Write a protein that binds this ligand. Structure first.
Ligand SMILES: *[C@@H]1O[C@H](CO)[C@@H](O[C@H]2O[C@H](CO)[C@@H](O)[C@H](O)[C@H]2NC(C)=O)[C@H](O)[C@H]1NC(C)=O
Length: 686
């Protein structure tokens, strides 16, 4: 029985409850319905909805955490948006600002004074407080050696804070009367009084809501400037790159189940009809106006423009940002039982063949290099960015998605020899993608359709990702298994048209179209064989021909063969001569890469540099183990790797790839988006 439900919204107070029923009537005259409740607290409202006792409730980031925590583990279904300038606002950046001419960054701040707005409030407490806890700054493991209050003393020497139930070394530079000071109500805080701290010099370090140094006084600028977590420091409007946190913007949670989208539809509709534009008696976002503190941001935040949707996958750990998460993880959510301080490197293993590979190391790395194995190679991307994982060595495409998520290359591979590594003379390496056409052949990029094709596998950059990539920009939709009359592409569907060329099994079980050892048309040469025996074209490397031609591949087929029988097929028709890989290649394909996070970079390279020669190719302990080798199969690290040098500092995946590469990789996956790739992406436009 098809879609048609009732959405029971969760409340907090009676006045907000009353406005709830006041929509009833419409929910009624409309398809999806409602049933409003009321809970004295939001924790109750959360445990309520959780136990299917209710549908959903819109929350803040400070709560959205708690809401996402177990056993609740509630999902963020849709955020709220606002009117500023930058873009289509969906957050509120958490920064920090001090006076110009500062002789420190943060690694030595274990003594200077400070200044907050109040305790347990974001930007002020929580955030910098948590960021510092997780950045080890404040030697702290649990309140019983240094409470959130205690620890302050053995970190600070001054803090202007309204929290005085226990500690004093966090109650100093607050201006005013001798009995009205450390009170949350003292005008020496909020966003201006604490901003008055650096202004009236009463406190050295002070971090508040961003862009307040604009609301306050656009004029006098550089007397104050923002300070980054990565050594750097910058000007007034330099927050979108030098802000402590990606402080979110009120979202809408819910459990994780079938009864979900209806929650999206009973609202989006409760918007398009009865929204800010509604010509009725309701303003679903609260018209910008003042009111009674009892009735503020009711049902939904009053200072909102509209509500934007949030991806299926999207969790707390993700929606609110890493920063905020890392910050608040430093708290009493757990001191260090399910979240230790293992500063040392670890790796996203992807396979039992890989985990243990990583494990094969973990003994001979005495902690210097840890492990966490995975199932889908895409688990890597989320884990690292989740802080759970540290690094990863992946293929071309995965690098794209990653970079969109915020992760980037830090130390790429080398496929020639270390005898061209530790230097900055000729950085990248030449491996090209070519459209191998036959000598007397018919084919060409202009009559390439309806041709029998030969791909290595359903996924290798040169042997697949690129063809389909270029192809996309002239395919209608990604009906790749609906272009060539047929072909072989080991890994494509069972009885598909794309496996038709696959000569499958060598004998025994009819393993056709397998990206397995058991395949005959597997790999570059396999797919080349394909061109020779069946196909009208084969997608492979620049020097894939040379490898066999010249009397090199001494097989039942190649024996004779001269590349004087193969030709390059250029995207413009030009039947280029094999030897011109440069002037007739499909794509200049990059080498793999260790994509990681913007905060552990230069030092992660180090870790790999330490172990580099320790367990590297020309390495010393070659009698113990290595790194690239693994049963003689590419495990995380391809086996055809010698150097793995520290790349260029301050680059980007877009740069790492190349326009002619990014361009097509970006616009290929456009043709068919995906979860991870979708979540990271909507977060790009925050
Ligand atoms: C195929 O890729 C893109 C996407 O279809 C085509 O055009 C875009 O290419 C890049 C984005 O992927 C951008 O740099 C271009 O500016 C963009 N085009 C426009 C009008 O903005 C591109 O033409 C195709 N590739 C080639 C080589 O033609």
């Amino acid at each position: 029985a098809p879609p048609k439900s009732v959405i029971r919204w969760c409340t907090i107070s009676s006045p907000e409850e009353k406005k709830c029923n006041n929509l009833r009537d419409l929910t009624q005259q409309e398809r999806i319905s409602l049933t409003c409740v009321q809970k004295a607290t939001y924790l109750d409202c959360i445990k309520a909805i959780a136990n299917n006792e209710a549908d959903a409730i819109s929350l803040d980031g400070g709560q959205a955490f708690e809401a996402g925590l177990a056993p609740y583990k509630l999902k963020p279904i849709a955020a709220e948006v606002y009117e500023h300038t930058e873009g289509s606002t969906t957050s509120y950046y958490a920064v920090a600002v001090v006076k110009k001419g500062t002789e420190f960054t943060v690694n030595d701040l274990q003594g200077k004074t400070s200044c907050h707005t109040g305790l347990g409030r974001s930007a002020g407490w929580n955030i910098p407080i948590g960021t510092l806890l997780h950045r080890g700054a404040i030697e702290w493991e649990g309140i019983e050696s240094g409470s959130v209050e205690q620890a302050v003393a053995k970190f600070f020497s001054a803090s202007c804070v309204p929290g005085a139930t226990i500690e004093q070394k966090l109650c100093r530079q607050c201006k005013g009367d001798p009995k009205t000071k450390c009170a949350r109500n003292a005008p020496y805080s909020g966003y201006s009084g604490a901003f008055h701290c650096l202004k009236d010099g009463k406190g050295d370090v002070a971090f508040v809501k961003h862009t307040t140094v604009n609301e306050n006084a656009p004029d006098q600028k550089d007397e104050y400037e923002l300070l980054c977590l990565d050594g750097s420091r910058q000007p007034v409007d330099n927050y979108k790159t030098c802000n402590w946190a990606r402080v979110a913007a009120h979202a809408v949670v819910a459990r994780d189940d079938n009864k979900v989208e209806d929650i999206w539809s009973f609202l989006s509709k409760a918007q398009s009809d009865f929204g800010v534009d509604t010509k009725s008696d309701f303003h679903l976002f609260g018209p910008p106006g003042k009111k009674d503190p009892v009735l503020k941001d009711l049902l939904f935040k009053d200072s909102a423009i509209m509500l934007k949707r949030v991806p299926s996958l999207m969790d707390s750990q993700l929606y609110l940002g890493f920063e905020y998460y890392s910050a608040i993880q430093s708290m009493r959510k757990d001191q260090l039982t399910p979240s230790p301080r293992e500063n040392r490197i670890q790796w996203c293993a992807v396979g039992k063949d890989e985990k243990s590979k990583c494990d094969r190391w973990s003994v001979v790395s005495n902690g210097d290099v840890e492990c966490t194995v995975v199932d889908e190679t895409k688990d890597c991307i989320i884990k690292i960015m989740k802080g759970e994982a540290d690094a990863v060595a992946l293929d071309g495409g995965l690098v794209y998605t990653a970079g969109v998520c915020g992760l980037v290359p830090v130390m790429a591979e080398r496929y020639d020899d270390e005898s061209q590594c530790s230097k900055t003379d000729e950085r990248p390496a030449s491996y090209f993608a070519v459209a191998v056409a036959r000598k007397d052949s018919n084919v060409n990029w202009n009559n390439l359709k309806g041709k029998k094709s030969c791909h290595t596998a359903v996924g290798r950059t040169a042997g697949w990702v690129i063809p389909m990539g270029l192809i996309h920009n002239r395919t209608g939709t990604c009906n790749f298994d609906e272009y060539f009359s047929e072909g072989c592409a080991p890994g494509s569907p069972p009885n598909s048209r794309l496996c038709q060329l696959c000569q499958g099994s060598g004998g025994i079980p009819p393993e056709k179209c397998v990206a397995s050892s058991h395949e005959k048309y597997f790999g570059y040469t396999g797919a080349l064989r394909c061109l020779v025996e069946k196909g009208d074209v084969a997608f492979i490397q620049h020097s894939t021909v040379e490898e066999n031609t010249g009397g090199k591949n001494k097989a039942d087929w190649a024996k004779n063969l001269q590349m004087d029988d193969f030709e390059l097929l250029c995207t413009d028709g030009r039947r280029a001569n094999v030897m011109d890989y440069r002037e007739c290649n499909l794509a200049e394909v990059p080498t793999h890469a260790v994509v990681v996070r913007p905060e552990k970079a230069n030092k992660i390279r180090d870790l790999l540099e330490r172990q580099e020669k320790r367990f590297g190719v020309n390495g010393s302990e070659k009698s113990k183990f290595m790194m690239f080798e693994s049963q003689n199969k590419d495990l995380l690290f391809k086996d055809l790797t010698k150097c793995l040098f520290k790349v260029r500092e301050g680059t980007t995946y877009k740069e790492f790839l190349g326009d002619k590469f990014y361009t097509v990789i970006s616009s290929l996956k456009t043709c068919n988006p995906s979860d991870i790739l979708q979540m990271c992406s909507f977060l790009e436009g925050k």
